[PDB]
């Protein structure tokens, strides 16, 4: 293998961490509470289709935020769902949690959402080729600069594994002022587990 996780390079330089705090001498509880909370909202993603998670740090409380393409579905009917969040969270935390929400815009040009969708389609035994192609269809036409898409594994629920994908636009990688995103998902019907990885580029 040879390549480098691309949001593992622009981190710190032009894009910043997504857990903004500072903890000297208290640096395992904070980490393994952040991990706990980050894991336990995977229930929402089943339908809410969230993208990001921040972990701010109060004086003695927990302020976070999220983004998802459906604000009504997450907060619920009369905001009661967010209350179930609060009460499950503080019980999970032992610390007063103060959540917040912002709506994501142009949810086509994300990366985790797109991988979520194409893995979804691959679950329903659909042709990977047209899946990738219509993904990049709706993506590029939303206004972008380049997309690549890779798929690997026991393709078409078939014999010895392979990998191949298609790309339009143009995506420079070794350059740094790139702001390129990246997302990697998984699925399978009955043949082990497949692999899809997606890269976008939306400005330097």
């Amino acid at each position: 293998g040879q390549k480098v996780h691309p949001i593992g390079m622009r981190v710190g330089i032009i894009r910043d961490w997504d857990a903004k705090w500072y903890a000297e001498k208290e640096y395992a509880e904070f980490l393994h509470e952040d991990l706990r909370i980050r894991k336990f909202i995977a229930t929402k993603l089943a339908d809410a289709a969230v993208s990001t998670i921040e972990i701010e740090r109060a004086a003695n409380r927990v302020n976070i935020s999220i983004h998802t393409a459906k604000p009504g579905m997450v907060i619920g009917k009369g905001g009661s769902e967010v209350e179930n969040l609060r009460k499950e969270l503080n019980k999970l935390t032992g610390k007063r949690v103060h959540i917040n929400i912002v709506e994501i815009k142009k949810p086509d040009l994300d990366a985790k959402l797109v991988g979520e969708g194409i893995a979804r389609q691959l679950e329903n035994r659909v042709a990977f080729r047209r899946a990738q192609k219509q993904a990049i269809q709706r993506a590029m036409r939303a206004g972008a600069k380049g997309i690549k898409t890779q798929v690997s594994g026991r393709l078409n629920g078939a014999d010895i594994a392979r990998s191949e994908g298609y790309s339009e636009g143009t995506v420079p990688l070794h350059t740094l002022r790139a702001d390129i995103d990246y997302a990697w998902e998984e699925a399978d019907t009955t043949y082990g587990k497949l692999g899809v990885k997606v890269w976008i580029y939306r400005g330097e």
Binding site: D16, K20, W21, Y22, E24, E56, R57, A58, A59
Partner: protein, 99 residues
């Protein structure tokens, strides 16, 4: 005099703007303020063998830095004292009021 404040964070912009804010809250009411004194910026180091079973050649080392600031003030009136007690923001950098 009898009050000072340390800073320890990672990105210098937040530290510097916190510095500007506290200097406002100090030289506003009274005077005799001290500037944003730089500091040696402690650094860490680690080394992770960039593989999973073998090949102890491919290393991948990471790091950590901690910029610092330091500001004392003289003749703190009851005004700016309580303004310090109430100023809390920003919330990315840890400060500590100290005599």
């Amino acid at each position: 005099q009898k009050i000072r404040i340390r800073l320890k964070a990672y990105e210098h912009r937040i530290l510097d703007q916190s510095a500007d804010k506290i200097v406002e809250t100090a030289k506003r009411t009274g005077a005799d303020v001290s500037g944003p004194i730089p500091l040696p910026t402690e650094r860490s180091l680690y080394t992770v063998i960039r593989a999973t079973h073998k090949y102890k050649d491919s290393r991948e080392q990471f790091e950590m830095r901690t910029h610092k600031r330091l500001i004392d003030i003289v003749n703190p009136t009851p005004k700016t004292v309580d303004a310090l007690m109430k100023l809390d923001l920003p919330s990315g950098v840890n400060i500590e009021i100290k005599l």
